[PDB]
DNA sequence: GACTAGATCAGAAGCAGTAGAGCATGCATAGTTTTT
DNA sequence: AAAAACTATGCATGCTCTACTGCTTCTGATCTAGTCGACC
């Protein structure tokens, strides 16, 4: 049954018999073989078939003993409906843990994830009512965030990267704040990231302090 | 369960044999009544003990016979389950005796038998029926003792006489029986004693407990004190989400059918095992393929298209309802509900829950309000979770004895048929004539079944069909007994008394001859 | 003639069921 | 009224029928398809013996018995079924509209004479007896033939010829951007022209709503249950007919089918001996009843004889005042007795005189009723029923006699002894107020059988393979919310006045 | 001469309504057994 | 010794077969009147 009409629903209500997507018969005809069922093809599972699939296949489409290909992984991922239980901090921590465990820090992007980034886009530091939107700083921050950098709007003690543009008037204030904070954040310029995007690597900050 | 004990006192004196020409003897009428009673008791397969004692017999068989007392009294049969032997004894080998006897002694011996035999068995209703002519001497010295014993033992008493308290007489013909002035002094004397003893036993209502053989043959009065009571259906009459009154519903009127069902047996062996019934399902094809019952599936017709419908699917998709629901959908004027639209095969009588005062007063208030406002309640009824819901009308019914609701089912939209019939008043071709109208008026007046009693300015029904027992059961019992006692004999014809009870009184028949002839002459009817 | 059902000629168009409508 | 009803749906296939003046509104073609499907479903549920046909004109492809150009007969006159409904639904949607356009086409010339001729030919093709020949024209063009006058004259002549033949034509005019004027061209084609229906219609025809209003109640033609004889005397007799104005509605009986192929299966019942296995003739078997230790053997003929008193018919007893007929003495649904005159002449006048005199004197004719042979007689009362008509001079209560069965003594059952308890005037007044708060008007057709409606909806869903069956609305439910809202505090006052403080009416 | 078509009737299939027998079963009352 | 749980049962509903009786409608056989083709 390829269409979920009333008869299919009634059969679903009774777990005596299974339901198979019509594509299974087409695939069988193409290879001229009795290929066994897969969770993707079937929409319902009888108790016996449900128990059988558990040992061979996981709760989702993915299986254990038989490898998974790109199409199989796509089908499995499409099976999941939604997952919005975590929070941005938790997701960032999990991502960083995964990268550290699997040493996935060599990818061209996401290399700024471990570092939080601040911009001097506010005329007065730590104020949300004096945005300086309308300059290159906004696009620089957006590029940093896209690459994987965590752009933070509040100058917390945990900030590690700060970018200052052509305006160096408040460099003294930034240095004083760095000295006051227990953890010091290196002073960086806007040209450093502009040059580093092409290389896709963390250039030494000694040349851009 | 429910059990009862009945004692039948039979008069076999010489006076019983005596009869007037053209009139059946009282002995024959008493025998017919007893035969009908035993027929209904035995063929109904009800567990009630029956005993028969004959007073006036030539012989004597009675525990109290010793002592030169209660002579000429014989106990034909003690308390035991009725059998065909009793019917055979009644039919053939029970003849009138030439020795007179006192009916009071018969009552005393009946009470003694009831007391003695009612030791090892449980009973909840004792009834004694006395059939006499009251044309013999009696002693009144024992009236007080018998009355006291009756009161103490809680034993119901009924009396049957050949006359009730001038065309040809008929058995149960809804006409006068035993014309006046044919009563001697002995029965006149007996009338006062029987009336006063009945009054003491019950009171004024006791006057209605003295029936007649002809009257009892068509009134079902013998079983009045032995009839059981139908079970009660408890529910809650709810007007809203908070108000609720506990109620009990009984079946006031329900069509009665034969409990026993005819069983098919083979003629050669007359046994059920020989006959075997089998069902085979086959396809519609030349080969006549046979398909197993399990292979069969359920389906429905959809206008030349057959759509499968499995039983499990039907159960899953079947309309679901909450069982035991008695909810008041609304209140409507009684004029908006017509007796024409009444549906169903039963009528429910709803009272308050037994042993409940608050519910009783609430139901009484609701009934009184409905009566005062002249309104009825449209309600939803459901016997259980499996019974289909119904829409019915409940209306008040207030009597000096009790007040209760009467519920009758109402029809749905799909249950109404819209038929068009040509009007008769506006039909000139079929228009009647003034003389025809007068003739029909005379015919209707002549054949009135109700009499206007000017003494009380009331209406008395001369033909109360509601009190007539169903003749089919009597005919079936008669035929069964005739076949059992006479295996080789054609079934007898319908008894005369059955036809008499099923026919109107001879008075209206005689008074309607001239009007009927007038109708015949004034109305030209030609068969086509 | 008036009120005759357009689907089944000869039968008046049955009014739709109104249930209970308190006054 | 004898015969079947034949219906033909004439749906225009012009370009204008596929354009909607407003957005998100179903096009006239879609509306016509929906109405045809609704009529098909209503016919299937109510009367499946009728014949329905669907013919399309103005298309490119043609399929007719006369090979007329630009006319397609999608479905000939035949009993409605699920296959036809599915075929119609195939064109319901916009994808269905494109499929219809590809399969047949549109934007092609047509002549009303040709479509009327093919409709008449389809009517002639039918071989049964038709009590009604009807044509429905679904179009949104009020001037189909304006360029050519000869075509208009031919169409008018064909419409007139169909009218004389006995074909009733209706125009289900649909929405038109400029408005539909019946008086322009269609005034002379419509079988009956209504005076009100003369202005320009800027909206859809009111008949579309009626067509879309599905009816799920079986319709049964008038039929006499039995034609019997009322015998006033032995030599006086009249002929009457008995009808069931009210009859319980039962769902169609289930049908056994072969699960493997879903085809009818013939059921055969056979009786054989347990020792021989051969078939047993009816004379071989006998009817027996067991009473205790005694057995009684009777033949089938004897058993039939047992329940036989008099020949079928009504024997008239004396008349009785209507006051003595208790309303609570109900046993069986009542019947309707009406003069027949098809067997004995002159019975109608006597019936009318009897009815008039019974109405004048307020009496009911008591009679003995025997419906069929070998049936025990029963007691019935014929109560006069005077003809009553509601507004617009439409009959609502036919004139005749109402046959009410009077229960026998055995039918009545005694009730347990009870003690009468009266309510104080305050409680009676409070309950009267409560009753008045829930007053409503009751009509015989104010309720729907939930079980039958649900079964019909489930059957329709299964037949059409719909996504889910349409859940019915149970009008029989008490809708306690409204009762609560209307009663207000009255329930609390009644409870505190009647029910003691500690009652707990729940167990 | 042959053929058609209308009519007239009779037989039979389909449908409706009812009665009888059997049966699953659901709620409730009475009898017996288990536990403290 | 007293309260609670399980089983017997039993009466009523609705369904199902199974048959019987009545009415309506379709099919087939037969009779009678009209029509066509050939001639003369």
PDB file of C-alpha atoms (C1' of nucleotides) in Angstrom, chain D residues 218 223 225 244 247 332, chain E residues 15-20:
ATOM      1  CA  UNK D 218     -33.414   5.477   2.381  1.00  0.00           C
ATOM      2  CA  UNK D 223     -46.658   0.526  -1.075  1.00  0.00           C
ATOM      3  CA  UNK D 225     -48.450  -3.775   3.281  1.00  0.00           C
ATOM      4  CA  UNK D 244     -46.751   1.526   7.718  1.00  0.00           C
ATOM      5  CA  UNK D 247     -41.136   1.816  10.091  1.00  0.00           C
ATOM      6  CA  UNK D 332     -46.843  -2.436  18.581  1.00  0.00           C
TER       7      UNK D 332
ATOM      8  C1'  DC E  15     -37.725  -6.476  -2.467  1.00  0.00           C
ATOM      9  C1'  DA E  16     -40.168  -5.559   1.936  1.00  0.00           C
ATOM     10  C1'  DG E  17     -42.098  -6.990   6.374  1.00  0.00           C
ATOM     11  C1'  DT E  18     -42.718 -10.368  10.014  1.00  0.00           C
ATOM     12  C1'  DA E  19     -42.225 -14.515  13.030  1.00  0.00           C
ATOM     13  C1'  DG E  20     -39.495 -18.283  15.039  1.00  0.00           C
TER      14       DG E  20
END
